[PDB]
From Swiss-Prot, chains A, B, C, D:
This is Nucleoporin p58/p45. Component of the nuclear pore complex, a complex required for the trafficking across the nuclear membrane. Contains FG repeats. FG repeats are interaction sites for karyopherins (importins, exportins) and form probably an affinity gradient, guiding the transport proteins unidirectionally with their cargo through the NPC. FG repeat regions are highly flexible and lack ordered secondary structure. The overall conservation of FG repeats regarding exact sequence, spacing, and repeat unit length is limited. Belongs to the NUP58 family. It comes from the Eukaryota. The gene is Nup58. It is found in: Nucleus, Nuclear pore complex; Nucleus membrane.
Length: 86, 86, 86, 86
């Protein structure tokens, strides 16, 4: 509905998507600390790790991009009205 | 020293970098939950946040990229010694 | 002023006090990871560390206790009125 | 094995425990910023949170207390060998 209503939903969906991001990174850290202390990490392990990081960001990027398009519309719309009344 | 002590040092920095990354992202989650508490998050607020996420990621990337190069060298040095003896 | 107004201030002051807590713990972790990787931690170090933890909680406990007394009043007050009108 | 490999293993668990502690507290900060976002944090909400903090701390304490005992033994074993040779 109203402008500020939709926006708020985007912001909350953003805050919830950032939450899941920090968690996956927290998960990936735990797993790294496990293998390390227990044995030691291999170049193969460091690679997987690295790989999962880019992957995780790409997943966050999708959300970011979506929120970006929606607010992009929201602002284009604004300027339309703004032109018409000024 | 041995290519196993140097690797552990790399892996060592990877973990520190990742921890430092997760913290900036934690701080970022709060700052947002702060603004929403006080008043509300505006489109400008969202954008700067959106922008700090990429800012904050690029930085992690310099870090990863570096560790990647160093382990690329170690991996190539290997295939050489491997070619030498077959 | 109003009941819900004062309360909200307590809650926000709580959320801000919890924030500083997690940060000190984050700081104490960083320092531990430094000494460890660099050299190794001594029994003396582990002791200081332990000590600062209890200290940090005690500092959080003070805030907790304060918020507890205020909301304790808030609820006692409520029951007064509740009795009087029921 | 040596009392220096066992100590490092203790210190190892200390760090893991502390990390795990900081996470529960991070999750706790979000959950609160979640409820406030949706509607608002009530007195009941605050209390359960207040209670999880002590719950969550007691648990960290079992962990610390343990590491304390083990390093107490190592410290006493020392003074014995020390008394023996003076």
């Amino acid at each position: 509905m109203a402008p500020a209503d939709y926006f708020r939903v985007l912001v909350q969906q953003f805050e919830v998507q950032l939450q899941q991001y920090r968690q996956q990174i927290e998960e990936l850290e735990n797993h790294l600390a496990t293998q390390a202390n227990n044995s030691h990490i291999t170049p193969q392990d460091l690679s997987m790790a690295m790989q999962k990081i880019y992957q995780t960001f790409v997943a966050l990027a999708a959300q970011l991009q979506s929120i970006h398009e929606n607010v992009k519309v929201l602002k284009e719309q604004y300027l339309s009205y703004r032109k018409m009344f000024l």
